[PDB]
């Protein structure tokens, strides 16, 4: 239809549920105010140079007020589960702890007793819990049940089952084929009529739901008791933490602190403690014994669990709907029932993955080991048994047998293995085993003469030096072989203690950021102030005789930071602007680095005490993001890694440490990621998989694994409710390449299937967008598409973000993120801080200039605003007051004005419950993430009461809403024929769904359209009655058996593993676009569009 434009095309899809050019934009004032602008913000005149096209032809919908039809969609999903939940909620018969029981169910809350579990809950609705051993098996050992009755299982009969003990191999390894056999209680009940929804708190119940979903079909839906909590009674990152310290052991605890326990404290409050848990933790680690203790108590665990379920629940709904939406609720119902494919490959993609981190370390070690070796030695100096020896000697320790008791006074028939030393238990030593042969000697000649004379010579050499019984029982040399130092002791995966070994940095000569010194091993770095102060090595004739005399290691250690000295200074100009142990700067003085002082966010210097000889040193920054102590680590995660890739760092002459820092840099991300990743373990489809020879056509080894892992996506969670899967909802491409420098691909791969999904850009930036514009009168705007302006212009909008940095000519990926940030919570100080660090010397003052400015430009007129934030002027003006929703709906409870609210009270939250609140900001942002923080650069998307939080969360809370529709509509439409498949994703700005191959094109429309709607709908509530083209037809909808954003990619890196998509499995298939996709599907389906393509 047509092509109309008081702005951006809208055409004829509208006619059905909207109007294309239909928004009642009022005459001169309204149409003009918006226009008067941009003469100031410089946008119009040329905006009239568009690339407008689209031909839209779709009739799938009916309703009056799209949302009216949205609440309907929400209605269907929400209802069947509302009904089965209803009855679980009003249920009358409390708890019945009978004796206890054993495995698979039956019942037993009883007039008397139990049994009859041949098969599962005919219950129609219940709750459940699950335990899993440190037998580490992610598999079960008991599952607790309420409304009807159900039960515990094979943990505790498991304990009399085979295979030998702990830490190697054993049976549960083969318990991986246990999955299919086990189920999750079948996993299901029937899918025939009413399906029990399940209200629980968090994970691994998410594991009861580790098996309830998986077979790819199932109308069970759940919802956290912890999620909702977050949702209703939740607290912010920093506020809660401050709130936590003071709270257990001053305004509005009503703390509602995630987990269960602290929430029950707020909802109900009695029997409020932990029936169980002092146990189960005093060794969420000891088993074999477990059953004993279990039999007696595990019923306890159960029950405690129940109350929670019951206590949060019967009270958790009402207040939830006290913030009343159908959609929010239904959208989260499916979010929880998410899925993730996997194949034979995860473990392998993951195991090849594991092989590399080692190589790497193993390798820097030798490098290291060697470089340190070379170094220390080449410096002929002083006297042996001291000085650089000390260094080389500690790190390298080996061939020791001194101690640790064990066996002794008992042991059986030695195989020439006889540890000496050995002290307390080991010394009820007795006679035996030493003598010589009749037998024979090897060569006839002087050889025997000599050979045999040698042992004589040697043998006696023993009667010679040292003590004689060391000989009895010869050693075998504990361990290693070359130059390496051994802290071991600690098993905790991914560890390399030779770097914590202070000293490594003087070795690995390192200064160069702020240009130089070399460093001190872990604190700060020297400079060149040939004092005339600092140094009075001076003289005269005195110095001659006495300097040499020395007195203390100091004059020798001093002489060293002094040779070290002139050289550091000469050495600095040369590279910057380019010996008997006292030649290599770092090493000498540094001996023992780098000492007292404080991290103290020291842009500064150390007023003596510290401070000796010719050069001054700046106790290297920074540490806020670290938060509390002295730098301590050169490779310290956080700031430091950033600078390794950073502009400044060291290893001056060659490959050396660059290789080193560079190497480690590669693996850091994986270390930590590592554990969490390897951990999900998994379950698999054995034979009762996808039928129809569907299994057949896809192509399939049949010698591979086709199971899948499911991660707890906290329904809600977050105060924004966004998501709660560190590992999986923290997906990333691979900028800092390497193992798990994303296993994303491997993630999905079922044969007969493929996954439709996509990415909406600034799904967040745009929301912020119309919001303001819409309230700056006509929603066209300024920042937001007013200022996002029509612009894309060849490269694209990042070129706009680019505009932000070019005026202020600078990198953009570093500039873009901070606006997002500006968009979020505060501005002013935060820019200076972050910008400063990532930036350099302009110092606080210049930082000021820039921070203030950037903020000035998008929000810098008097009282509160001009530039770009009439919206925030509204987020702020609408939200510094009462409690609210986000113009769309749903309420975010904790509140500055609103925490305060029955007027001005009690010192007014101290007036520093608010000042302690002044302190959280910046720290909180570099903290926000527990895993990695602010992310890696090149992408990096991660973001007490008062604006900041609140304001930041509006956008966020509102992008949650966003997610739910995409979802609600899609779920809806899948039902709506052309059936397809699954998923919840809701990852970042990505939302992937699974589909059979066919109707994979079909879903494409779904998504497409679903967004149009979402988008469409947003404006009507938010702003009013209309919206544009560009957004409408996304970018394109992506289809592939792989999981990476923007298909062709190929993902070399994991630097390892990297034959990748060659190393193979899959390899990239495009996302159709909007125009194309519609061509094949032609007006969607039933079974009608069908033949031709």
């Amino acid at each position: 239809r047509h092509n109309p434009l008081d702005i951006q095309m809208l055409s004829r899809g509208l006619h059905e549920q909207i109007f294309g050019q239909g928004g009642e934009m009022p005459g001169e004032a309204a149409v003009r105010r918006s226009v008067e602008h941009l003469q100031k913000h410089g946008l119009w005149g040329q905006p009239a140079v568009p690339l407008p096209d689209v031909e839209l032809r779709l009739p799938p919908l009916y309703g009056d007020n799209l949302d009216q039809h949205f609440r309907l969609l929400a209605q269907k999903q929400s209802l069947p589960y509302l009904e089965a939940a209803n009855l679980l909620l009003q249920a009358q018969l409390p708890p019945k702890p009978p004796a206890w029981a054993w495995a698979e169910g039956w019942t037993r809350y009883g007039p008397e007793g139990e049994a009859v579990p041949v098969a599962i809950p005919e219950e129609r609705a219940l709750v459940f819990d699950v335990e899993v051993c440190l037998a580490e098996g992610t598999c079960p050992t008991l599952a607790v049940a309420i409304s009807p009755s159900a039960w515990y299982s094979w943990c505790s009969q498991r304990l009399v089952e085979e295979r030998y003990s702990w830490t190697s191999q054993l049976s549960p390894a083969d318990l991986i084929p246990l999955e299919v056999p086990t189920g999750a209680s079948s996993p299901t009940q029937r899918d025939w009529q009413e399906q029990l929804v399940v209200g629980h708190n968090v994970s691994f119940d998410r594991a009861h739901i580790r098996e309830q979903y998986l077979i790819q079909g199932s109308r069970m839906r759940f919802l956290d008791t912890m999620s909702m909590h977050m949702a209703i009674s939740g607290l912010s990152s920093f506020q809660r933490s401050l709130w936590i310290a003071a709270k257990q052991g001053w305004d509005w605890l009503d703390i509602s602190s995630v987990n269960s326990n602290s929430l029950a404290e707020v909802h109900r409050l009695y029997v409020g403690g932990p029936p169980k848990e002092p146990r189960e933790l005093f060794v969420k680690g000891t088993m074999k014994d477990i059953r004993e203790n279990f039999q007696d108590l595990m019923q306890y665990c159960a029950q405690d669990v129940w109350a929670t379920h019951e206590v949060f629940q019967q009270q958790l709904p009402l207040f939830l709907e006290r913030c009343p939406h159908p959609v929010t609720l239904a959208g989260m119902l499916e979010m929880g029932v998410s899925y993730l494919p996997v194949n034979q490959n995860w473990e392998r993609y993951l195991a090849e993955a594991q092989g590399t981190y080692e190589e790497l370390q193993r390798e820097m070690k030798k490098s290291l080991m060697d470089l340190a070796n070379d170094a220390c030695q080449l410096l002929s100096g002083e006297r042996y048994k001291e000085d650089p020896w000390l260094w080389d000697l500690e790190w390298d320790l080996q061939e020791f047998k001194q101690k640790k008791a064990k066996k002794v006074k008992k042991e059986p028939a030695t195989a020439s293995k006889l540890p000496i030393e050995g002290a307390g238990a080991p010394g009820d030593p007795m006679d035996q085993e030493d003598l010589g042969p009749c037998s024979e000697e090897e060569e006839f000649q002087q050889d025997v003469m000599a050979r045999a004379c040698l042992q004589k010579l040697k043998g006696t050499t023993e009667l010679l030096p040292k003590r004689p019984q060391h000989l009895p029982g010869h050693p075998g040399w504990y361990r290693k072989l070359c130059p390496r130092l051994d802290d071991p002791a600690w098993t905790p995966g991914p560890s390399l203690l030779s770097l914590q070994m202070r000293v490594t940095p003087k070795l690995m000569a390192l200064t160069w950021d702020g240009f130089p010194l070399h460093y001190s091993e872990r604190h700060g770095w020297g400079y060149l102030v040939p004092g005339r102060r600092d140094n009075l090595a001076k003289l005269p004739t005195g110095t001659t005789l006495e300097s040499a005399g020395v007195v203390c290691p100091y004059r020798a250690i001093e002489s060293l930071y002094r040779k070290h000295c002139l050289e550091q200074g000469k050495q600095q100009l040369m590279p910057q602007e380019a010996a008997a142990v006292p030649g290599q700067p770092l090493a000498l003085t540094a001996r023992g680095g780098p000492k007292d002082t404080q991290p103290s966010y020291h842009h500064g210097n150390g007023p003596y005490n510290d401070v000796d000889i010719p050069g001054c040193w700046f106790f290297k920054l920074p540490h806020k993001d670290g938060n509390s102590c002295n730098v301590g680590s050169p490779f310290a995660k956080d700031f430091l890694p950033k600078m390794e890739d950073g502009t400044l760092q060291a290893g001056p002459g060659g490959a050396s440490g660059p290789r080193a820092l560079e190497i480690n840099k590669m693996i850091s991300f994986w270390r930590n990621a590592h554990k969490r990743i390897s951990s999900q373990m998994v379950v698999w489809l054995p034979r009762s998989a996808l039928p129809r020879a569907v299994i057949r056509h896809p192509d399939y080894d049949e010698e591979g694994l086709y199971g899948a892992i499911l991660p707890q996506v906290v329904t809600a969670g977050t105060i924004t409710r966004r998501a709660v899967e560190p590992t999986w909802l923290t997906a990333s491409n691979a900028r800092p390449d390497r193992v798990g420098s994303e296993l994303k691909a491997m993630v999905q791969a079922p044969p007969g299937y493929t996954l439709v999904g996509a990415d909406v850009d600034s799904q967040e930036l745009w929301i912020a967008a119309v919001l303001g514009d819409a309230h700056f009168a006509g929603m066209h705007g300024c920042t937001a598409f007013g200022w996002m302006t029509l612009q894309g212009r060849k490269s694209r909008g990042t070129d706009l973000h680019s505009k932000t940095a070019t005026t202020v000519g600078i990198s953009r990926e570093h500039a873009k993120i901070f606006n997002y940030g500006r968009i979020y919570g505060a501005g002013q100080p935060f820019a200076e801080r972050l910008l400063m660090q990532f930036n350099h010397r302009l110092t606080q003052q210049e930082a000021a200039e820039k921070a203030q400015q950037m903020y000035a430009a998008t929000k810098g007129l008097r009282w509160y605003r001009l530039s770009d934030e009439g919206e925030w002027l509204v987020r702020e003006l609408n939200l510094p007051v009462d409690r609210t929703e986000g113009g769309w709906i749903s309420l975010q409870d904790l509140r500055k004005v609103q925490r305060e609210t029955a007027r001005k009270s009690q010192w007014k939250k101290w007036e520093v419950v608010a000042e302690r609140a002044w302190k959280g900001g910046t720290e909180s942002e570099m903290f926000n993430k527990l895993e990695s923080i602010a992310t890696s650069d090149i992408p990096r998307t991660p973001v007490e009461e008062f604006m900041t939080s609140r304001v930041n969360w509006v956008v966020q809370s509102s992008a949650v809403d966003y997610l739910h529709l995409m979802l609600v509509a899609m779920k809806w439409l899948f039902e709506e024929f052309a059936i397809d498949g699954r998923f919840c994703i809701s990852i970042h700005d990505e939302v992937r769904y699974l589909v059979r191959e066919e109707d994979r094109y079909r879903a494409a429309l779904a998504l497409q359209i679903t967004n149009l709607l979402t988008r469409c709908m947003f404006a009507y509530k938010l702003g009013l009655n209309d919206l544009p083209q560009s957004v409408a037809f996304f970018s394109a909808v992506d289809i592939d058996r792989c999981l990476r954003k923007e298909v062709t990619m190929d993902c070399k890196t994991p630097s390892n593993p990297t034959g990748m998509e060659r190393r193979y499995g899959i390899p990239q298939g495009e996302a159709l676009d909007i125009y194309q996709i519609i061509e094949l599907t032609k007006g969607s389906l039933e079974k009608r569009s069908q033949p031709g393509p």
Binding site: E352, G355, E359, R362, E363, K366, S367, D370, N373, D374, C376, Q377, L378, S380, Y384, D392, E399, E442, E443, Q446, D447, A450, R451, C453, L454, L457, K458, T460, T461, E462, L464, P465, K466, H474, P475, W477, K480, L481, C482, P483, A509, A579, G583, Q584, P652, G653, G654, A655, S656, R659, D701, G1059, R1062, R1063, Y1064
Partner: protein, 396 residues
């Protein structure tokens, strides 16, 4: 560039001297060296390449599957259809793999026809260097290189994965024997046909070099070799039938070795921009790497008793399974220090100078090994510590 040239002389000169490269002259110059118009390698030369073949060889032999082209035959007399002469020069194998093939079907009878393995061994093949012509007679000259070819007759499925499997393994082998293995990449530069199999290279002081190779020319040459009615035996899957695939054989090059001594001391730049210039350097071979493990030593009197028992160590040592340099001779030439230097310039791990301190200072395994650990060693434990040394060192 001038610094790069100096590094080369250092790493080459040391090779002429200290005997690693038998021949001297222009036929040796980098370019020529790589072509092969060189006279050869020192004994040292042999010990390393042998260790290598040997060391590399062990890995190859291990898994459930393993065999040989069995022979490796310069050979090849014959006319027309098999190989096609293109240009000019000679008749000495150019495909250790080719032969490996005739042996194929029988290699097939092997393992019960069961298998889908890798049939191979090591031997010398010849390369000619013919930049370009015109001047006089024509097509003269010849270069030589000792290769390792592993063939594999793989199903359509061992396929890309089995090829890719190799990628993996090979790479970990190098790093294993590499002092700074980051100079060992792979590319996938070629073919609009047969598809993948990547080329390998080393990062010399002047860029990359082609080393090993890796193709998947899955079952295309056998059809070439053994015509059929669409004949013969296909080969077993395990109850089905298939025509066996290609196995990419990194060639050899003496070069792999050639890059190692590089890696080791390659490590030029090492101290090119760091510390004071006392850059005497040392070459560095992973222990298993080095041709010689240690230089026995002996000094003072009686001159013999000590030359003796060194005599003594050697055998004991010789016997154990340790390469040695006997230093009785050694007391003669030089003065202590340059011994060190030579040795370090030699890679010989540690050195023990049995002198007055040796019996008469009754005992002592006298010190040497670097990072300057001149710690006294009662001769034995240590001797048998070295036995350990190898073991752990090797392992990784």
């Amino acid at each position: 560039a001038p610094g790069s040239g100096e590094g080369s002389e250092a790493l080459l000169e040391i090779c002429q001297r200290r005997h690693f490269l038998s021949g001297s002259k222009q036929q040796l110059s980098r370019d020529s060296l790589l072509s092969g118009c060189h006279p050869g390698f020192g004994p040292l030369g042999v010990e390393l390449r042998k260790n290598l073949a040997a060391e590399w060889w062990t890995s190859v032999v291990v898994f459930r599957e393993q065999v040989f082209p069995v022979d490796a035959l310069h050979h090849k007399p014959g006319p027309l259809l098999p190989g096609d002469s293109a240009f000019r020069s000679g008749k000495l194998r150019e495909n250790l793999l080719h032969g490996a093939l005739e042996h194929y079907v029988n290699c097939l009878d092997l393992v019960n026809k069961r298998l889908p393995y890798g049939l191979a061994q090591i031997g010398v093949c010849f390369h000619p260097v013919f930049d370009t012509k015109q001047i006089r007679n024509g097509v003269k000259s010849i270069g030589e290189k000792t290769e390792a070819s592993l063939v594999w007759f793989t199903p359509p499925r061992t396929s890309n994965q089995w090829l890719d499997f190799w990628l993996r393994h090979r790479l970990q082998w190098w790093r294993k024997f590499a002092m700074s293995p980051s100079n060992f990449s792979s590319s996938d530069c070629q073919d609009e046909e047969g598809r993948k199999g990547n080329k390998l290279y080393y990062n010399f002081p002047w860029g990359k070099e082609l080393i090993e190779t890796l193709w998947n020319l899955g079952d295309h040459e056998l059809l070439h070799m053994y015509p059929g009615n669409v004949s013969k035996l296909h080969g077993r899957d395990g109850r089905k039938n298939v025509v066996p695939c290609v196995l990419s054989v990194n060639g050899d090059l003496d070069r792999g070795m050639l890059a190692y001594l590089y890696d080791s001391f390659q490590l030029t730049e090492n101290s090119f921009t760091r510390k004071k210039n006392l850059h005497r350097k040392v070459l560095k071979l992973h222990p298993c790497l080095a041709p010689i493990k240690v230089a026995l030593d002996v000094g003072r009197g009686p001159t013999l008793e000590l030359r003796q028992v060194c005599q003594g160590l050697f055998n004991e040592l010789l016997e154990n399974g340790i390469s040695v340099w006997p230093g009785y001779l050694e007391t003669m030439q030089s003065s202590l220090e340059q011994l060190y230097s030579k040795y370090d310039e030699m890679s010989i791990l540690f050195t023990v100078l049995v002198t007055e301190t040796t019996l008469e200072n009754g005992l002592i395994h006298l010190r040497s090994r670097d990072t300057t650990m001149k710690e006294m060693m009662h001769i034995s434990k240590l001797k048998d510590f070295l036995i350990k040394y190898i073991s752990s060192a090797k392992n990784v």
